[PDB]
Design a protein around this ligand. Structure first.
Ligand SMILES: Oc1c(I)cc(-c2nc3cccc(Cl)c3o2)cc1I
Ligand SMILES: Oc1c(I)cc(-c2nc3cccc(Cl)c3o2)cc1I
Lengths: 116, 115, 115, 116
C-alpha cells in the first residue's frame, strides 16, 4: 500500500471515523484530475486508495473533508477541508502515510515516508 | 484589519520571514480568483491584505508558500504549500488571524477569531 | 521582557483567557522552585513574568493549567496540565515566547526566540 | 497492551527511532515513582511498558527524551523533554496511545483512548 491516510480527533481522543477523503493528481494540462477516494474506517485509517503501478510520479492533493466530520458532531468548524499537497515518487517509489489531527478551529498534518 | 496571517518556524524557533502568501476568493463558477498577497515580515506577520468593506462573506483560500521557504534554508520539504480554506462569516467575530507553524514534513494551522 | 507565554484555544478559535501559568526554575538539588506565575489575559498572553536580570541561565519549567481551563468550559480533558521544560541560554536571542495551542485531548507547543 | 507510545519526526517525515521514554506514577505521598521505561522501535512505537493488572488508576507522567534524540541528529533543540501528564483509568480500564510529533523547537502530542 503506497498511500494511506490516518485521521485523529483531538477533542474526543479517538480516531476520526467516517471521514471522506478525495485524492487528486495534477495533470499535464495543470488541472486537478480525480485519482482516488474513500472514507476512514473505525481505526481512523484509509487504505487501498491506489496501487504501486498506478501511483506514478506526480503532484498529489489529499483533501480531507473535515467540515462534514465536525458538523455531524454538532460543531461548526473553521475550515472547509484540510488539503495536503505534495510531490510523490520524485526519488523513486515510496510509501506515504498522511496523518491529520483535527480540532474545530485547527488541524495538524504530518507525513511518514518510507522506502519499500 | 480583518485578515492577518502569522507564520512560525518550528525548526529554528523563530518567525518564518519572507514567506509568500496568496489569498484567493472562490468565484460563482467555483474557480479561485486572486484576492491579495504579500510576504511575511521580520515578525512572521502579514497585515494589510484586505479591508472590512472588501472582505465580504464567502469562501477564501490562504496559500502559504512553504516549499520555497524550506528551499531557501537548504532543507527538503514534503509539501508544495500549506492551504487554509475557510468561510468568512459576518455573524461571528470581526478579525481573523490565520496562524501556521511550519516543519519540513509537517504543518499545523489554527484560526484566532476575535473582536 | 524576556519570557512571554501565549495560549490559544483550538476548539473555539480564540485566545485561551484566564489560564493559570506557573513558572519554576530547577534548583541545585534538582527540585523545582517557584519562580513566577499569572493568568493569561483577554489576548491569551502573559507578560511581565520576570526581568532580564532575574532570568539567568538555567532550566525552567512552564506549567499551563489546561485541565482547569477545559473544566470551566464543561469539556472533559485528557491532560492534567501542559508542561514546557527548556534551558535558558545567553548565547542566543534574548526574548522567549512559549506558545501553546490547546485541544481537550491534545496540545501543541512551540518556542519563538527572538531579539 | 494498555499503554503505548508513538513518536514521529516532523523534520525527516519518519518514525522517531531509539527515543527513550520514562513513565512515572504519582504516589500516595505525592511524589513521582518510577513505573516503566523503554525506547521506541524502528516504527517509532513503544509497546510492553505495563500490563492491565499493574496499570491501576492514578496520575501518570510519560517523559519522552526529545533532547537526546535531536542532539544525536546534530540539532540543539529547545526542550529538555516532552512530558505528558494524565489521569488514567478513572472511568474504568482503558487502553492509551500517547502520540508525539517532534520538531527542534516544537512538539505536538495527542492521546488515543479506547475501551477494551
Ligand atoms: O502570536 C502567535 C500566534 I496568532 C500563534 C502562535 C502559535 N503557536 C502555535 C503552536 C502550534 C501550532 C500553532 Cl498553529 C501555533 O500558533 C504563536 C504566536 I507568538
Ligand atoms: O499511528 C499514528 C498515530 I497513534 C499518531 C499520529 C499522529 N500524527 C500527528 C500529526 C500531528 C500531531 C500529532 Cl500528535 C500526530 O499524531 C500518526 C500516526 I501514522
Amino acid at each position: 500500500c503506497p498511500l494511506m491516510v490516518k485521521v485523529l480527533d483531538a477533542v474526543r481522543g479517538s480516531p476520526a471515523i467516517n471521514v471522506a477523503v478525495h485524492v487528486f493528481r495534477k495533470a499535464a494540462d495543470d488541472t486537478w484530475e480525480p485519482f482516488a477516494s474513500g472514507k476512514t474506517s473505525e481505526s481512523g485509517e484509509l487504505h487501498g486508495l491506489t496501487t504501486e503501478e498506478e501511483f506514478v510520479e506526480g503532484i498529489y492533493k489529499v483533501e480531507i473533508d473535515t467540515k462534514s466530520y465536525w458538523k455531524a458532531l454538532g460543531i461548526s468548524p473553521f475550515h472547509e477541508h484540510a488539503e495536503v499537497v505534495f510531490t510523490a515518487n520524485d526519488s523513486g517509489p515510496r510509501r506515504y502515510t498522511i496523518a491529520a489531527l483535527l480540532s474545530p478551529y485547527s488541524y495538524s498534518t504530518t507525513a511518514v515516508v518510507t522506502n519499500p
